[PDB]
Scaffold this active site. Sequence first.
Site, PDB file in Angstrom:
ATOM      1  N   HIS A  41       0.811  -1.215   0.000  1.00 22.68           N
ATOM      2  CA  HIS A  41       0.000   0.000   0.000  1.00 22.68           C
ATOM      3  C   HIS A  41       0.845   1.267   0.000  1.00 22.68           C
ATOM      4  O   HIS A  41       0.288   2.363   0.130  1.00 22.68           O
ATOM      5  CB  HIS A  41      -0.991   0.006   1.173  1.00 22.68           C
ATOM      6  CG  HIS A  41      -0.362  -0.001   2.534  1.00 22.68           C
ATOM      7  ND1 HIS A  41       0.360   1.062   3.032  1.00 22.68           N
ATOM      8  CD2 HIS A  41      -0.398  -0.925   3.523  1.00 22.68           C
ATOM      9  CE1 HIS A  41       0.765   0.782   4.258  1.00 22.68           C
ATOM     10  NE2 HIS A  41       0.319  -0.418   4.580  1.00 22.68           N
ATOM     11  N   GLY A 143       3.510   5.631   9.999  1.00 19.90           N
ATOM     12  CA  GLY A 143       4.848   5.522   9.459  1.00 19.90           C
ATOM     13  C   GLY A 143       5.595   4.277   9.887  1.00 19.90           C
ATOM     14  O   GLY A 143       6.677   4.010   9.348  1.00 19.90           O
ATOM     15  N   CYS A 145       4.658   1.178   9.414  1.00 19.16           N
ATOM     16  CA  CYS A 145       4.480   0.111   8.436  1.00 19.16           C
ATOM     17  C   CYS A 145       5.808  -0.255   7.790  1.00 19.16           C
ATOM     18  O   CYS A 145       6.609   0.618   7.447  1.00 19.16           O
ATOM     19  CB  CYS A 145       3.484   0.536   7.355  1.00 19.16           C
ATOM     20  SG  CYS A 145       1.750   0.321   7.777  1.00 19.16           S
TER      21      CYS A 145
HETATM   22  O1  LIG Z   1      -3.243   1.434   8.982  1.00 21.68           O
HETATM   23  C1  LIG Z   1      -2.716   1.841   7.925  1.00 21.68           C
HETATM   24  C2  LIG Z   1      -3.367   1.729   6.653  1.00 21.68           C
HETATM   25  C3  LIG Z   1      -2.804   2.176   5.514  1.00 21.68           C
HETATM   26  C4  LIG Z   1      -3.433   2.084   4.191  1.00 21.68           C
HETATM   27  C5  LIG Z   1      -2.972   2.863   3.129  1.00 21.68           C
HETATM   28  C6  LIG Z   1      -3.565   2.773   1.885  1.00 21.68           C
HETATM   29  C7  LIG Z   1      -4.609   1.901   1.678  1.00 21.68           C
HETATM   30  C8  LIG Z   1      -5.069   1.117   2.712  1.00 21.68           C
HETATM   31  C9  LIG Z   1      -4.486   1.201   3.961  1.00 21.68           C
HETATM   32  O2  LIG Z   1      -1.569   2.750   5.503  1.00 21.68           O
HETATM   33  C10 LIG Z   1      -0.867   2.892   6.676  1.00 21.68           C
HETATM   34  C11 LIG Z   1       0.374   3.484   6.563  1.00 21.68           C
HETATM   35  C12 LIG Z   1       1.128   3.652   7.711  1.00 21.68           C
HETATM   36  O3  LIG Z   1       2.353   4.225   7.653  1.00 21.68           O
HETATM   37  C13 LIG Z   1       0.634   3.228   8.954  1.00 21.68           C
HETATM   38  O4  LIG Z   1       1.368   3.386  10.094  1.00 21.68           O
HETATM   39  C14 LIG Z   1      -0.608   2.643   9.049  1.00 21.68           C
HETATM   40  O5  LIG Z   1      -1.068   2.237  10.254  1.00 21.68           O
HETATM   41  C15 LIG Z   1      -1.398   2.455   7.895  1.00 21.68           C
END
Ligand SMILES: O=c1cc(-c2ccccc2)oc2cc(O)c(O)c(O)c12
Lengths: 306, 305
Positions: A41, A143, A145
């Site tokens: 993502h 961030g 992820c």
């Molecule tokens: O819960 C998250 C979900 C998504 C996401 C992005 C595009 C489409 C679907 C889900 O991106 C993230 C990015 C991050 O850096 C982060 O810490 C996150 O907790 C998430």
Amino acid sequence: SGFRKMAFPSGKVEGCMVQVTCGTTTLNGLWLDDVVYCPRHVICTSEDMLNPNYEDLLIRKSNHNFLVQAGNVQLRVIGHSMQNCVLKLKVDTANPKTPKYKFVRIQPGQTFSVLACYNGSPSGVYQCAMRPNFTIKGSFLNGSCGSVGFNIDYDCVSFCYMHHMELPTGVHAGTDLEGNFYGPFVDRQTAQAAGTDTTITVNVLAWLYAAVINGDRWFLNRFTTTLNDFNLVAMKYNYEPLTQDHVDILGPLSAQTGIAVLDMCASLKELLQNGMNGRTILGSALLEDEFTPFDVVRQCSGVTFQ
Amino acid sequence: SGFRKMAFPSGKVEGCMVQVTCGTTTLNGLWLDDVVYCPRHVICTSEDMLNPNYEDLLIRKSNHNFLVQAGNVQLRVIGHSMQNCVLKLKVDTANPKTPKYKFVRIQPGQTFSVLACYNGSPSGVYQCAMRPNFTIKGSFLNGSCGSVGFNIDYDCVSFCYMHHMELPTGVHAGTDLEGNFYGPFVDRQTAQAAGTDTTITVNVLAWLYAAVINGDRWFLNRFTTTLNDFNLVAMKYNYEPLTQDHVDILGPLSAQTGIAVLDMCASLKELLQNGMNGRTILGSALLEDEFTPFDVVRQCSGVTF
Ligand SMILES: O=c1cc(-c2ccccc2)oc2cc(O)c(O)c(O)c12
Ligand SMILES: O=c1cc(-c2ccccc2)oc2cc(O)c(O)c(O)c12
């Protein structure tokens, strides 16, 4: 003596953490050999969180759309490929700090360490357990992820978790390193909820053995129980059912303490019924369930404080 | 979201741990520049442990009695020396993985990460707090001596602890890296008991703010308290007295959450004289006191190293 929620030394994973940017999205990546793994993502934009077609998003990308950064060095992408929900960026350069490693999938109840990272740089490390409902109770800000979960056995880093999202209840879901989620979760911003969580029974028993090894047994009693009568009692406290396989796994610890597994099961039944009456066990006033039987044997001594 | 007992990344310290062998006894050493630091009691034997004379014990040995092993490479000892309760072994090689570092002596109530080691090999890392009775509640077996505790600030490791011994109740005693002991203990096999411990008040309140920051607010209330009035309550339950400076240090957490410090003190008061009433806080049935105010701000803003 003592007992702590103890993570693995994270140095070997620290050397593999990079930073991946696509457009205006930046997250963490795992650099091993000439490949960088990160959540797919990273290619989603603000109007892509609900129903993204990642195949359609990826084909619109070239190699130079992905900025990969290892500290100050900029690794040049020379190839990209998608596998389930992880993205694999072929880079110019083998990571010289690549340790011996393997990708593994774990089962619920198993433990691992998390190196929480931000912008490719580590923030901290801690122990985690895959809850029966396939979530983990981590510490994740936006961030994070791309932060990975791992175990270390004889200088080999078994990678098992990569963080993907935060659930509306505050727990966290992610994939293995081949991109396949733990649980029924998906990388969409649509409303998801985990199944009813449950206490990891075999871990609580291993923890009770660790309390005996360290020299405490005020919670034991003279009773035994059948496995079925235990499971019938335990499930009314929302405990996972205990199987014969779990019983076999508590074998070494039953042999070290001389307490039979169903005797420790009997003690647990009374602890659920009574509580602790103002006492603690290994410095906790609750029943801990994030130490596996292998964890306890690892951290504990070979001789009981008898 | 989520709050965990989070240790510092251990990689910088990992490249500094070596094995120190003196005859029969094997423990861990800290290799920095061209010196190896380790507990001086690596020099004792089973006989010496009861009333040792470290000065005389050390005079009788030379450099080749000391076996230093950095993984597979053996480091030659070119000199040996004692600074308080740690032994300094000058080696032929300046550690190439030596990080930017300093030796720091901490205060009771302060937290640090412990890199538990055995035969010079790191096995695990966890957070500690130094107790107000100068012990720490670690997880050490035999062979863990020489393991160090540290903090990190933007690439600089601050070593604050070296492990020396276990006390009869199972808690642990050690020294700073200059060999000065934390608390009233000696590296002698004798009767030593940790003093009556107490709870780190400023750390419990920082952890209550952490619970508020994480949207767990059921323990607040509409009362006030002066500093004194709260301190009169806290001492019954064996809580450390909360000073004015502690109230100052809780300022940033007060500003972010909108809960004034003494309002949170009022909330801790009722939590003490009544209990949790069945509920928990951040998945804990005890009032946790091993997070400083700085730990809470570091975890909830994701500062990196
Ligand atoms: O819960 C998250 C979900 C998504 C996401 C992005 C595009 C489409 C679907 C889900 O991106 C993230 C990015 C991050 O850096 C982060 O810490 C996150 O907790 C998430
Ligand atoms: O408690 C300990 C006490 C002594 C000691 C040292 C000199 C004279 C008498 C006793 O050495 C140790 C060595 C270790 O490797 C260790 O893990 C320990 O806990 C101890």
